[PDB]
Amino acid sequence: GPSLDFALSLLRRNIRQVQTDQGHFTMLGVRDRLAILPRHSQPGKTIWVEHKLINVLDAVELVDEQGVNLELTLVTLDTNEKFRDVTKFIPETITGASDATLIINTEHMPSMFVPVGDVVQYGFLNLSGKPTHRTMMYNFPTKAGQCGGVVTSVGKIIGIHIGGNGRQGFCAGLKRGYFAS
Numbered sequence: 091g092p093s094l095d096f097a098l099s100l101l102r103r104n105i106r107q108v109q110t111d112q113g114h115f116t117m118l119g120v121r122d123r124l125a126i127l128p129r130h131s132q133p134g135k136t137i138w139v140e141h142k143l144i145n146v147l148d149a150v151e152l153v154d155e156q157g158v159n160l161e162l163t164l165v166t167l168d169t170n171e172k173f174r175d176v177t178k179f180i181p182e183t184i185t186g187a188s189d190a191t192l193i194i195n196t197e198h199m200p201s202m203f204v205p206v207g208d209v210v211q212y213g214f215l216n217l218s219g220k221p222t223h224r225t226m227m228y229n230f231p232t233k234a235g236q237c238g239g240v241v242t243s244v245g246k247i248i249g250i251h252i253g254g255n256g257r258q259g260f261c262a263g264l265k266r267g268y269f270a271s
Contacts, residue, residue, distance in 0.1 A: 096245055097193055097203065103174045105195045105240055109138035114196040116238035118250065119173035120180075120269050123147075127163045128237040128252050128262070130218070137165070144168060152268065158223045161252045161262045164269075177269050179247045184224055184263030186210045187243035192232070192251060192259070194239040206230040206259055209241060209248065215260055217253050224263045225252070232259035 108117040110131045117139070119125040127133055129151055136143045145168035152160040186209045194202040206228035215225040226241075232254040239251035241261045249261030 093191075093244065097191060097242060100176070100240065100242065100247075101193060101195060101201055104176055105193055106139050107196050107200065108140075108238070109197075110134065114198055114235055116193075116195045116236070116240065116251075118176075118238070118240050118247070121175040121177055122172050122271075123167045123169050124269060125165050125167060125173070126250055126264075126268075127165060128250060129159065129161045129163050129220075130237065130252075131163065133163060133165055137167075139167070154223050156223075159220055160224050161217060161220070161222045162250060162268070176247060177266055179245055180264050180266045180269065181246060181248060182266050184211065184226070184265055185246075185248060186226055187241075187246060187248055190228065190241050190243040190248070192228075192230075192236070192239045192241050194236050194251075196235060198235055204230070204232070204236070204239070206232070206241070209243070209261070211263075212260065217260070222252070222262070225260050226263050228259045228261075229257070230259050231257055 241249035
């Protein structure tokens with residue numbers, strides 16, 4: 091079906107299993123050699139991607155216009171070829187959704203689909219003693235090991251999972267402008 095094929099195609103073409111020194115994460119490749127990680131993955135000069143070590147050419151820990159953490163790291167990778175460009179599926183402004191699917195892809199949780207439900211604008215979040223802006227929330231008890239997971243709804247890629255508190259899950263909202271050249 092259309093939504094199942096979209097999620098499965100994202101898994102195949104854009105959503106990679108990675109390892110850093112901080113463990114297992116999911117990584118969305120967005121276009122060209124640009125990918126996005128949760129900040130707390132703390133990528134070094136190399137990152138394990140699926141089956142090989144990939145050099146990290148740049149890493150930008152994103153902050154807002156007031157300098158508050160957004161809990162996202164934008165990595166430029168020394169990859170052979172370009173990621174299929176999925177920027178057109180990312181909204182221009184941080185937008186919630188109804189009945190979203192969270193897509194996890196690590197060695198421990200490969201090709202995993204999680205029905206998180208409605209995703210709403212949340213804003214400020216204190217995540218592990220790191221204040222964070224531009225978050226959205228879902229009332230779903232997500233678990234450890236799901237950071238970097240891709241929040242999706244009806245052909246839209248809206249957020250990257252950054253944590254939870256046992257009853258709720260939180261993502262960093264995505265804006266298309268983060269990925270402009």
